[PDB]
Each structure stands twice: as C-alpha cells, then as structure tokens.
Amino acid sequence: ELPQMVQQLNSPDQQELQSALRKLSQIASGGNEQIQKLIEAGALSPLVKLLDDASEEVIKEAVWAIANIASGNNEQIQKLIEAGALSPLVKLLDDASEEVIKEAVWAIANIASGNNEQIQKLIEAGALSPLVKLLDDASEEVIKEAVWAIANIASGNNEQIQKLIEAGALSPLVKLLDDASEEVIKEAVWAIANIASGNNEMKQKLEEAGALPALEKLQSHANEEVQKNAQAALEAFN
Template sequence: MDFTNANCNNGEIFMFQSSSPPKLVQPTPPPPSVIHKAKYKRNSISKNPEEARQKRIELDAQVRRKHREQLITAKRIKHNLDAYKDDDAESEFDLTHHDIEKLKSGLNDSDRDSRLSSLKDLSTYLADPPDTLKHFVINDNCIDILIKFLSGADPEEQLQATWCITNIVAGPKEFCQKAFTAIPHLITFLRGGNISLQDQAAWAIGNLAAEGPECRDLLRSNGVLIPLIELLNSKNVSIVQTTCFALSNLARGPNANLDEFFSAGITQYLLFYLRTDEMDEVVSEISWVLTYMTSSEDDKYIQILLKEGIVPLLVKHLRPFNHGPLALPLIRTFGNIASGPDENTDILIQQPDFLPAMLEYIQSDCRPVKKESLRVMANITASRRPEVLIKVFNAGFIPILSSIATHTNFDIRKEAAYSLLNIASHGEEYMRPLPHQDLLPGFLEFIRSQDIDLIRLGLGYVELLLTQVQNGQQLLEQMQGIDALESVTSQEDPSLRDTSTRLMDKYFGEDFNSNINEIQSTE
C-alpha cells in the first residue's frame, strides 16, 4: 500500500442496521517481561582479542530501540502524513463545540448521504484532532456511534467508520484504549469478502499493534493472527502490504509468540513474495516482518528461516533497491542474522552479491541506511573465522571504512570504527595492513571527545597500535597522542582513567603515574 496517498473506494451501499457486536476477549496476563537485547554484535575493547571477539556489547541499545520506535511511529501515520504537522504546531482544524455538535448530528442523521459526509469529515479531522474533538473521542460517545456503523449492514458506512477507527488508533494511547471495543469488528472484516474493508481493517489493526504490548496481547487474544496471515494469500497488492504492516507490529517485543506465526504458515507466504515480487514497496513491507521475526533472543527462529533459504532471496533484492528508507528493514534483517553464530555470517558472505551490495550501502547518502549498514558490517567483522575477514579485505572495505571513520560525523564514524577494531582484534596480521597514518588522528579525536563510547574506542585502537604495530609508539608520539592520553585522566570513568594511565606507564615512562598524581593533588 502507498501509505502516503491512501484513500477509500466508494461503492454501492445500504442503510446500516444495528446488530449484536462480537465479543471482545480479554488476554490472559503475560508472564513477567524478559529484557530484550538489541540484535547487534560487535566487539568491545578488551584485554585480549579472544575476549573482544566473544563479548557483545550493546552500548547504544536504547538509542537503536528509540530510533526503531520512531520509524514505526512515522510509518503508521503515513496514510495521513500530509495532514500532520510538527508536535509543537497548532492543529490544522479549529472545531468549536458547536461544530462538534453539528458533526454528531450529521453522524446520527436519517439521511445516508449526511451520515457518510460526516464520517468522511470525522476521519479528516482525526488526522490532527483539536482539543474539542479529542474530548468527543475520549469522553463522549464517538466510539459508540462508530461501533453502530461497524455493526451495520452498509459496506460504505462500515468502511468510512473503519477509516475513522484507523485514524483514532493512530493517535495517543487514550484514543487506542477507547477503540478496543472495535477490535472484534475489525477481525471480522478481515475474513469478509469486501477488499476495501479488509485493507482498512488490517490498517487499523496495524496501528493498534504499534501502540504497545497491551494492544498486541488484546489483538492476539481475540484471534487476529490467523486471519491476518491468511490475507497474505490475497491477489491484491495493497492488502498484502497493509497486512505485512500489521504483522510486523504484531511480531514486535519479547512476548510476540512467534511460534504462532510459524505454525500458521507465515514463512511460505513471505518466501513466495520474495521469490516473485519485484516491487520495492512490497519487499520492504515483507522485510519489516522479517526484521521482527529475526530480532528474538531465541536464535531458533532465524535458523528456521535460514533452512528455508531466506538469505539468497533477501540478497537478490539488495542491489536493485535504491538507497532510501525502503531498504532499511532489509538491511536490519541482515544485521539480525549476522548477530547470531558465525555460521550465520558464513551463509551471508557465501552469497556473491552480499558484500558488494553492503559496500555500496555503507556509502549511501541516506543516513539511517548508512548507519544500519555499518552495523551489519560490525556484526560481520565480529566473526571469528579468518576467511570472513579475508573476503572483507578483498571486497575493498578497508579504504571505505577508514574514510568513514575519520571524515564524517562522530555517530557515523563510531559505527565504522567498530568494524575496524573488530578486524584489528583478530591479530597482528589484520592490524598491520590498516592505514594507521590516516586512522590515528581520527581515533585521537575520539579520545579527546567527551563521549565515553568514543573514548573507549579510541583507547582500544591506541592499545592495539602500541601492542601490534612495530612503529606504533613512534606514530603516537608524532601525532601528539600522549596529550590525548593525558586528557583521559580527568574523566570520571575509572576504567578509562586506568587504561590511559596503564598505557602511559608502560610505553612512555614509569614516572607518568606519579606525575599525574602530583598534578591532581595540585588541582
């Protein structure tokens, strides 16, 4: 579905008739939450290479999760993106209490055209609701009125009411909670014969699922998963895209019950579309589903997908993709796969097009794509297999990673630096060929920064330089590296201070520590 220009189809309709609504099933309380780790493997700066290879640090896990939530949040409101303004901007619509009463009157009018016109107005206003409309949704009978339309027999009124629900659940949490009573109706529409209603119901469910664990649990308890997966069999491209949007949000979180996804046969549909579909938009939506299905702490789900041959199908879509945000979930899925055992990495790099495509993506002009691609390479270079690093060298990554690590913004540089340090930590034969004359000034900038992660990266590189490169000490002296190390002694983090002091004592004189103590006592 094109979430930027979605609209409803008009058709012949009938007068709505009230009927008994389906029963809303409440979910059973979930087990205690499990802390979900970010699927990101990279080496830390440790005392020896083997420890560095085995440790998977997640220093930016919270940042990645926040970034991921922002992406999903933006996605779920794309269908009305042109109606949204900045958070600090005033609402586009200024509805008085009189306007709201007029709207309510239209929704309850005996004339069908008046009701439809009012439903369409309501869906538009809900794109950016003023306070008066928020009160109507939260404290008045807005949802009750919409439920009557959903329970009726007029397909067009059902469609317009579902459109209203879709926009309501794209709003704040209070809106979503008020719309819970619509869930059974939405699920019923999924299995109906009205394509427009199926599409719009899946859209609303996707927005609900994006709201949080409570909504996802409620949807699953009411049996949403199987009818959604069955919709993947649709011949309608829009429905397939919208269904994937909903499924990707349902697959989020540590309590996603992914076993249900696999037992319902989701893999056969995903594999089918990856084999046959050439539309970037469809592949992107499929990849969002895979992103969350591969983000579980339990590696068994990735292994199931690997055995089904998912990697070649994903790789074939890398090169034709543009470097825009549509490629983001595809790249993130690769990152999740590479975060697992080294055998996973082997499967990736055995694909002839994988590393050449990643070399293009780490140079992308799209910042999120560039950053995620660098994280994939950090996972790849964390492999303990020498043949992996040889392929990375031969594919031409070292000059590009070195340039990124020294010439772009700090956050991007940091991602490239992890790959370089992962490579260097494999031993002297991999550390020596790196362009240290170019790299050292950049890593010294890291050390002089006030960012703990950057300082740690810089110290890690300097330690490897001093221990594994013959002229490392001379290079450090030539580039004022001693001053950079001294600057770390003012840091509050004791591990950083200790590392800096240890390196100074060992390589630049035994009196350094006493000199530092004298300086600190003077201060």
C-alpha cells in the same frame, strides 16, 4: 469487538474486510498487550492468509500489521512464525511493488531481531537471497531497511553469518560503505561490525571483500557518528 473483526477478515465484501484490517493494524501498533489480544483472539492465521490476496491494498495493510506484531516479544514473534508468516513474506521480496517490499523487509528484520532459532527459521524460509539482491536492485529507502534486516541476521551465530556470506552479502555491503547516503553507510557498517565479530575465516572473507580500506577510509567521514561506528567495526575486526 475482536472476534467479530477477526471473523470479518474472511468477509466476502472487500470494504468490510479492508475496514476490519485497518482496525487490526491499529491494535497491532498498540504495544505488546494489544498484540497479545490479537494473538489470543485468533487474528494471526487469517492475517497471514491475506498475504496472498489479489490486491496489494489488502496485502500492504496486512504486512504493516505483521511488521508491528513482530515488534513484540519473542513468544509473540514465535506465534507469527507458527501461523506460517515467513514463506509469504519472503515471497513478497521479489513478486510485489517496492511499496509492499519495504513493509515486508521491515517485518522480516523484526523477526530477525528475535532469537537464533527464529533467525534460523528466516534462513530456512529462503530470506537471505532476496534480501541481498535488494541491495543492488532497490531504492535507497528500501535498501536502508534491507541492510538493517541483514545486520540482524548477522548478529546470530557463526553458522548464520556464514549463510549470509554464502548468499553474497559481502560485496554489496562493502560497496554501500562508499556509493550511498550517510544513513545507509551507517546501516552498512553496523552489519559489517556484526560479521566482523565472527570467526577468523569470516574476518578473512571480510578482508578479502575489501572491507578494511573502506572502513579506515571512511572512518574519517563528514559525519562523525559514522566515524565512531566505523571505529568499532575495525576494533571488532581485530
């Protein structure tokens, strides 16, 4: 049952490992009571220790599970942070395939959907720069999940939003309001709306970055659900 699967994550046979990992992912996508059993069975440390395995075949699977475990409550996110997950996840954002990175980004967004202290831990782990870089360098698919990670960071407190700005988030975000697909624009405006709820220096940084014309312009857009959200980003900007 669970302790045997956990023991198997450190197995020397790659097929029993890989099959163990897959069972664990299954459980980890089973809602918060299922996640609680993984935590209480000791799964979390060995799982995170797999983020350094030689094949991305193991790694992808371990990140997918971690993404799901971070969908749980904030106490559960906290256990993931204590098991050391942040550093290897951040490391994957530049040293791994786009396939893995999408999963890493998803994991990281969910962790950032935790409380402010947990968002602080993501920053200290150096998340902000590789996330921002993805916005210029990655496929629209990956960019869409990165923008959502960035937005969750932007819902944190003012010191946190200033760190994003320092990491260069503004111009790439502003640029996404135009030269991108409608699903990405939506994600981008939501991130900007969060920033726009900042203090007056940040608004000003927002205005400097060219945000207001882009929001005014493409409020009146084919999709009228973005109209609505573009609206509220301007209202939030005061």
